[model samples]
Target: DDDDKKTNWLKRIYRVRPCVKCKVAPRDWKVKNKHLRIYNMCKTCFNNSIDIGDDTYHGHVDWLMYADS
Candidate 1:
């Protein structure tokens, strides 16, 4: 239980996204079979996604650390 909780609580601050408009990161930043649901993107890719869309589509991450959650 301790290990499980420790690993989950330690966030890498990594985020990923998949969008047609994503124009950042390496050409093959996101590998379909590699990390599909994992860190599927880089910071640049996320910024690009935000610039294009997906921002309002997924709303916001309301499941992270919060002092007033």
Candidate 2:
């Protein structure tokens, strides 16, 4: 009972979201906001898609409201 309560509290505090590509839950802290904004994917997927020679991936910046013609 004592250990169960402690584990429940930890799980509640650190909620995770499912990855867009893999549909697997990853720790919230392991991924960054910028990564989510750009790729809408998880860290594992991002690393796999990265172009080593170019040193960049094919990702686009998020669009801002009222910033387009």
Candidate 3:
């Protein structure tokens, strides 16, 4: 889908929030376009996470687009 192609800005795409004591970032907790939202975490938070989602996760983006209000 060329339409999926984008020409825009970006940011720190992180969501998981660890306790003040937690140091190692979770390797499993992930969300695509999670950074696409304002609720997305800040870079200073050390969002050292990764994206492990598959096709099932891709559906979230499509679903959101259709339900966006």
Candidate 4:
């Protein structure tokens, strides 16, 4: 059925993936600052590691450099 087929496709696209940092929690893809780029880190860890103030204060320049190392 056309409706059934559409639902299946949508479900496939929403498949859960593990977080990159913890590698245990399941979460959808999320993007933070441009410096960090796209990552699959869970919301819990993401909030813990990043600062709301840093995004505007420093543009995450430190993080960008840290990732390089």
Best by TM-score: 4
Q: Which regions of candidate 1 deviate over 4 angstroms? A: 1-38, 55-69
Candidate 2 local lDDT, 1-69, one digit each (tens): 665564565455344534455657542233343222334455676565564433343343342222122
lDDT by residue (1-69, candidate 3, tens digit) is 432322112222223432222333422233346223232222323343224322221111111212223
Give RMSD (Å) of candidate 4 vs. truth: 12.6
Misplaced by over 4 Å in model 2 are 1-17, 27-39, 51-69
- Local error of candidate 3 at residue 6 (angstroms): 18
- Order of the predicted models by TM-score, top scorer first: 4, 2, 1, 3
Candidate rank order under lDDT: 4, 2, 1, 3
The global C-alpha lDDT for each of the candidates, from Candidate 1 onward, is 0.39, 0.44, 0.27, 0.44
TM accuracy, model 3: 0.16
lDDT of 3 at 59: 14
**TM per prediction:** 0.25, 0.30, 0.16, 0.36
Alpha-carbon RMSD to native, per candidate: 10.7, 12.2, 11.7, 12.6
